[PDB]
Design an enzyme around this catalytic site. Sequence first.
Site, PDB file in Angstrom:
ATOM      1  N   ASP A 203     -35.989 -27.037 -30.534  1.00  0.00           N
ATOM      2  CA  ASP A 203     -34.693 -26.802 -29.842  1.00  0.00           C
ATOM      3  C   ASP A 203     -34.617 -25.334 -29.401  1.00  0.00           C
ATOM      4  O   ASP A 203     -33.764 -24.597 -29.933  1.00  0.00           O
ATOM      5  CB  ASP A 203     -33.521 -27.219 -30.740  1.00  0.00           C
TER       6      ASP A 203
ATOM      7  N   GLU B  76     -27.346 -12.969 -41.986  1.00  0.00           N
ATOM      8  CA  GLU B  76     -27.077 -11.729 -41.214  1.00  0.00           C
ATOM      9  C   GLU B  76     -26.074 -12.048 -40.101  1.00  0.00           C
ATOM     10  O   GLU B  76     -26.206 -13.124 -39.484  1.00  0.00           O
ATOM     11  CB  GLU B  76     -28.404 -11.209 -40.654  1.00  0.00           C
TER      12      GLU B  76
ATOM     13  N   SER C 138     -24.223 -28.399 -33.179  1.00  0.00           N
ATOM     14  CA  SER C 138     -24.260 -29.876 -33.360  1.00  0.00           C
ATOM     15  C   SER C 138     -24.261 -30.226 -34.855  1.00  0.00           C
ATOM     16  O   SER C 138     -23.704 -31.289 -35.209  1.00  0.00           O
ATOM     17  CB  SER C 138     -25.450 -30.479 -32.657  1.00  0.00           C
TER      18      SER C 138
ATOM     19  N   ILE D  15     -16.250 -18.832 -35.735  1.00  0.00           N
ATOM     20  CA  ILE D  15     -16.732 -18.049 -34.552  1.00  0.00           C
ATOM     21  C   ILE D  15     -17.224 -19.009 -33.459  1.00  0.00           C
ATOM     22  O   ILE D  15     -16.961 -18.733 -32.265  1.00  0.00           O
ATOM     23  CB  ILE D  15     -17.821 -17.035 -34.964  1.00  0.00           C
TER      24      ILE D  15
END
Length: 294
Positions: free
Chosen positions: A143, A99, A34, A30
């Site tokens: 991040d 999920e 990184s 999909i």
Amino acid sequence: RVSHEQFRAALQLVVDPGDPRSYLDNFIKIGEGSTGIVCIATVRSSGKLVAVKKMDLRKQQRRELLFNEVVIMRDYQHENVVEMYNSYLVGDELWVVMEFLEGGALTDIVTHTRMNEEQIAAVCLAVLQALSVLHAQGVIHRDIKSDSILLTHDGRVKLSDFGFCAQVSKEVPRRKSLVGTPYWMAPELISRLPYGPEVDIWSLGIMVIEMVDGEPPYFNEPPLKAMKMIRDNLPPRLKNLHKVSPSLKGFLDRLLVRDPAQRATAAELLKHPFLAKAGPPASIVPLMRQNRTR
């Protein structure tokens, strides 16, 4: 001298043992972070759709971060955090079965469409509600960006990509390690100093610029020079500083504070008036590619 083998054994215990290829079939890629690939699969028994993050142990810059994912997905469960079903170990890869989020990434929405304030406020709220719980238990998700934020069919916000979070204690309350996306980084982190959990509050501020201006500050610039500019020069500002309400500007001013001691906390921001504008998760549904006509 930590051998590839010694590492695998360390994970061998914390993960679900066995081969997940036994009960999963429909493997198709999909996207790509990184750390690895986010290939989506189908279950045999239930017949349900689940995301399977594969990450190579050998091909890693900071290998001991692989723990962050799974170790936070469990023990740190929440409504605005992604749910992990299982986590196995295969060949030389770490496979985390999660999920499937129908809404997709936020990266898509901010770049292609322009979000109004009531939608922007809803996203910030959900993140802070997640962070306030993490920060309180002493977690730094280093991040934060639109790329790390996923949405449901409802449009309910889900913080993800925990691989770049960090634990802090009374013994070790701050860290030096340089982690995150160059543009969404706080200056104190860019400067390689002791940084607490307020790095996420700046990063959330950079995401608000991304949400408004579509891309973050100095994005067109190279990555090293972009950081120098965030570290040396003033707090970055919006191009559409005329369209924004008095409330939003005032909110973002508390997020983008250079001095971490002066920069607002998670708990503080929850009380800020701006988050009253926050519209129902259902108001994000039209802006999702699936429903976008182009």
